[PDB]
Curated annotation (Swiss-Prot):
Quaternary context: Interacts with p53/TP53; the interaction is direct. Interacts (via CTD region) with CDK9 and CCNT1, acting as an associated component of P-TEFb complex. Interacts with RELA (when acetylated at 'Lys-310'). Interacts (via NET domain) with NSD3, CHD4, BICRA and ATAD5. The interaction with BICRA bridges BRD4 to the GBAF complex. Interacts (via NET domain) with JMJD6 (via JmjC and N-terminal domains); the interaction is stronger in presence of ssRNA and recruits JMJD6 on distal enhancers. Interacts with NSD3. Interacts with NIPBL. (Microbial infection) Interacts with bovine papillomavirus type 1 regulatory protein E2. This interactions may serve for the tethering of viral genomes to host mitotic chromosomes allowing successful partitioning of the viral genome during cell division.
Tissue expression summary: Ubiquitously expressed.
Sequence similarity: Belongs to the BET family.
Outcome of substituting residue 99 to A: Abolishes binding to acetylated histones
Known function: Chromatin reader protein that recognizes and binds acetylated histones and plays a key role in transmission of epigenetic memory across cell divisions and transcription regulation. Remains associated with acetylated chromatin throughout the entire cell cycle and provides epigenetic memory for postmitotic G1 gene transcription by preserving acetylated chromatin status and maintaining high-order chromatin structure. During interphase, plays a key role in regulating the transcription of signal-inducible genes by associating with the P-TEFb complex and recruiting it to promoters.
Miscellaneous comment: JQ1, a thieno-triazolo-1,4-diazepine derivative, and I-BET, a benzodiazepine derivative, have been tested on tumors with success. Treatment with GSK1210151A (I-BET151, a I-BET derivative) has strong effets on mixed lineage leukemia and promotes myeloid differentiation and leukemia stem-cell depletion.
Residue ranges annotated for the Bromo domain, each copy included: 17-123
Localization, UniProt: Nucleus; Chromosome
Name this protein carries in UniProt: Bromodomain-containing protein 4
Entry comment, domain topic: The NET domain mediates interaction with a number of chromatin proteins involved in transcription regulation (NSD3, JMJD6, CHD4, GLTSCR1 and ATAD5).
Site (Acetylated histone binding): 99
Free-text description of this protein's post-translational modifications in UniProt: Phosphorylation by CK2 disrupt the intramolecular binding between the bromo domain 2 and the NPS region and promotes binding between the NPS and the BID regions, leading to activate the protein and promote binding to acetylated histones. In absence of phosphorylation, BRD4 does not localize to p53/TP53 target gene promoters, phosphorylation promoting recruitment to p53/TP53 target promoters.
Length: 127
């Protein structure tokens, strides 16, 4: 099986805006997570072909990854910070759904998720 197309990261029909919360998500949250020692499996769409995971996109029907999230932020694709936060949550829950408790990739996701939650606890009030 081929990989599916990646999620949309640009739509010229969508209205755009900048908010201090979206700037924080890009400049602080995504930066902090990207540099984490466990980030690398999460920095791009899951390449099921390359990794020989025939069942990944049979099980995961709402794919998400931090590469996609970053592109969405850089493209001003998100209107609301909540959209971005949901995409992070989708990413982590996909990892948990595909794998099993205690799997190394799951422990890696948990660590990134704990860090994510800590950073979004510091999200500035909407300016
Ligand atoms: C030792 C090793 C070698 C290569 C990789 N690379 C890699 N890249 C993208 C995906 C996954 C992956 C995911 C996954 C990752 C992100 C996500 F959002 C949802 C699911 N869930 C499982 N996997 C692999 C399945 C085969 N065994 C390695 C993990 N692994 C990782 C590790 C630990």
């Amino acid at each position: 099986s081929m990989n599916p197309p990646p999620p949309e990261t640009s739509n010229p029909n969508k209205p755009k805006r900048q908010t201090n919360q979206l700037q924080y998500l890009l400049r602080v949250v995504l930066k902090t997570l990207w540099k984490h020692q466990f980030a690398w499996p999460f920095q791009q769409p899951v390449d099921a072909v390359k990794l020989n995971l025939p069942d990944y996109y049979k099980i995961i029907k709402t794919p998400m990854d931090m590469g996609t999230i970053k592109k969405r932020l850089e493209n001003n694709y998100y209107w609301n910070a909540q959209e971005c936060i949901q995409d992070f949550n989708t990413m982590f829950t996909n990892c948990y759904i595909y794998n099993k408790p205690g799997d190394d990739i799951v422990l890696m996701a948990e660590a990134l998720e704990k860090l994510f939650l800590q950073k979004i606890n510091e999200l500035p009030t909407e300016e």
